């Protein structure tokens, strides 16, 4: 159920937020580290219904960008819907340390037959958002594979359709 | 949250279930009225993880139907994850009786600017599943519009991505 977040711009503007048009809605696509957007709890995949009282419906990505650049510093209110697409799947590493899926650019592309991912019904064409809690958005595939390896048997992955 | 369902085949060996492969997973695409599939609570959007202790990952819908069809035992055992893509949006009719969207083949195509659908972030390219608890999967657009006409001010709609 929607929430109202109040954000304040930093030194020279910039909320540290990249918005994207998807299905005539507006969604958070990137959250900068140590950003006013991250310090309030904004995450990749959160829907934005309202920016300073105004509806985002039908806004193109570049309109969403322009609207944010023109907002005044000490107050930027938004109506947010915490990751409407968010799903959380738990897997169990095998003898080789493998959970059972192939990924590319942070998106699951393949499911290994007879694996943990197959038993747990992990879906392809979904972005990996969090592994065990850590934000893996924007990370290179090698870094994601690293986090997966340095984790224990139970792997709590958070996926979202792409 | 996955649960094991035990379906019991009718006199025809049918269960009233149509399946569809989405993103290397198997999904329920149509549940016939008063069938063994409706009986156990299967619904459009439900993910089928296993069929008779056999993983559905990668399977095509023909493979899934072929497997349901084969092994004509009275009991089919499925592992079901309930509607993983289900989203509920509450809108309220304006002075004219409109929440503010356009649909074509049970799918939202457009959002009217400055409307309840816009205010509540309704998304296009989504299938309407339910309108105030009423199943609309399978119904024609005219029948969907009849439900909306006979609705109160509050219109609660369950939606899922079209894919
Ligand atoms: C049953 C069974 O489970 C099984 C069986 C045989 C296998 F070969 C594998 C398997 C072997 C290697 C991989 C590589 C796979 C990976 O390690 N995924 C994790 C989540 C995992 O599945 O553990 N990776 C690593 C990587 C790095 C950089 C770019 C892309 C990738 C990628 O796709 C995936 C699966 C898994
Ligand atoms: C503010 C504001 O809200 C506003 C204002 C002006 C408007 F013209 C409208 C509006 C008026 C009519 C319609 C037609 C629209 C509809 O009645 N949708 C329901 C869910 C609703 O939005 O109430 N329909 C009816 C229909 C029948 C058969 C096939 C397709 C359709 C279809 O798309 C859609 C929007 C809505």
Here the CATH number for the domain that contains residue B41 is 2.30.42.10
Cβ contact B130:B160 at 8 Å:
no
**B13 CB neighbour count, 10 Å cutoff:** 11
Cβ neighbors of B42 (< 8 A, separation 6 or more) are B5, B7, B17, B28, B31, B80
Cβ neighbors of A10 (< 8 A, separation 6 or more) are A16, A35, A36
Breaks (C-N over 2.5 A) in chain A follow: none
Contact B118 A84 (CB under 8 A): no
End-to-end CA distance of chain B: 23
- Domain end residue (candidates: A81, A104, A124): A81
Smallest CA-to-CA distance from A60 within A28, A26, A30, A85 is with A26
B94 shares a domain with B64: no
B95: CA distance to ligand 2 center in Å? Answer: 13
**Helices and strands in chain A: count of H runs, count of E runs:** 3, 12
The range of the structural domain enclosing residue A43 comes to: 3-81
Query: What are A2's two structure tokens?
Result: 């929607």
B57 shares a domain with B26: yes
Contact A123 B56 (CB under 8 A): no
Binding site of B, by residue number, is 105, 140-141
Cβ contact B139:B123 at 8 Å:
no
d(CA B45, CA A22): 21
Query: What are B113's two structure tokens?
Result: 């600017």
d(CA B112, CA B118): 7
d(CA A10, CA B3): 48
Question: E-strand spans in chain A?
Answer: 3-7, 17-22, 25-31, 47-51, 54-55, 76-81, 87-92, 101-104, 107-111, 126-131, 134-135, 154-161
Q: Does ligand 2 come within 6 angstroms of the Cβ of B98? A: yes
Cβ contact A90:A120 at 8 Å:
yes
Structural domains counted in chain A: 2
Please tell me whether residue A158 adopts helix, strand or coil conformation: strand
A74 shares a domain with A110: no
Cβ contact A99:A70 at 8 Å:
no
A50 shares a domain with A115: no
B66 shares a domain with B8: yes
Please tell me whether residue B42 adopts helix, strand or coil conformation: coil
Cross-strand partners of B126: B108, B161
B108 shares a domain with B91: yes
d(CA B59, CA B72): 20
A66 shares a domain with A8: yes
Count CB pairs under 8 A between chains A and B: 72
Please tell me whether residue A18 adopts helix, strand or coil conformation: strand
Identify the experimental approach: X-ray
**DSSP element (H, E) containing A54:** strand A54-55
B7 shares a domain with B74: yes
The shares of helix, strand and coil residues in chain B, as percent rounded to the nearest 5, are 15, 40, 45
- Domain end residue (candidates: A81, A99, A121): A81
d(CA A100, CA A113): 8
Final resolution, Å: 2.5
Cβ neighbors of A134 (< 8 A, separation 6 or more) are A147
d(CA B161, CA B47): 14
d(CA A110, CA A70): 42
Nearest CA in chain A to B123: A23
Cβ contact A49:A2 at 8 Å:
yes
CB-CB neighbors (< 8 A) of A49 in chain B: 119-121
A95 shares a domain with A157: yes
CA angle A23, B86, A4 (to 5 degrees): 65
Question: E-strand spans in chain B?
Answer: 2-8, 17-22, 25-31, 47-51, 54-55, 75-81, 87-92, 101-103, 107-111, 126-131, 134-135, 154-161
A76 shares a domain with A25: yes
d(CA A88, CA A71): 35
**A33 CB neighbour count, 10 Å cutoff:** 8
Contact B49 A87 (CB under 8 A): no
Cβ contact B159:B129 at 8 Å:
yes
A93 shares a domain with A70: no
Cβ neighbors of B112 (< 8 A, separation 6 or more) are B98, B100, B101, B102, B118
- Domain end residue (candidates: B57, B81, B105): B81
A102 shares a domain with A32: no
d(CA B70, CA B26): 17
Cβ neighbors of B20 (< 8 A, separation 6 or more) are B26, B27, B28, B29, B61
């Amino acid at each position: 159920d929607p929430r109202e977040v109040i954000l304040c711009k930093d030194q020279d503007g910039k909320i540290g937020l990249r918005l994207k048009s998807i299905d005539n809605g507006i969604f958070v696509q990137l959250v900068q580290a140590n950003s006013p957007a991250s310090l309030v709890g904004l995450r990749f995949g959160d829907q934005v219904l309202q920016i300073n009282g105004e509806n985002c419906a039908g806004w193109s990505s570049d309109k969403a960008h322009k609207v944010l650049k023109q907002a005044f510093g000490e107050k930027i209110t938004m109506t947010i819907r915490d990751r409407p697409f968010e799903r959380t799947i738990t897997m169990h590493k095998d003898s080789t340390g493998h959970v059972g899926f192939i990924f590319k650019n942070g998106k699951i592309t393949s499911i290994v037959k007879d694996s943990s991912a197959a038993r747990n019904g992990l879906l392809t064409e979904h972005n990996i958002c969090e592994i065990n809690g850590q934000n893996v958005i924007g990370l290179k595939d090698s870094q994601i594979a690293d986090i997966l390896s340095t984790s224990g048997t139970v792997v709590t992955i958070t996926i979202m359709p792409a």
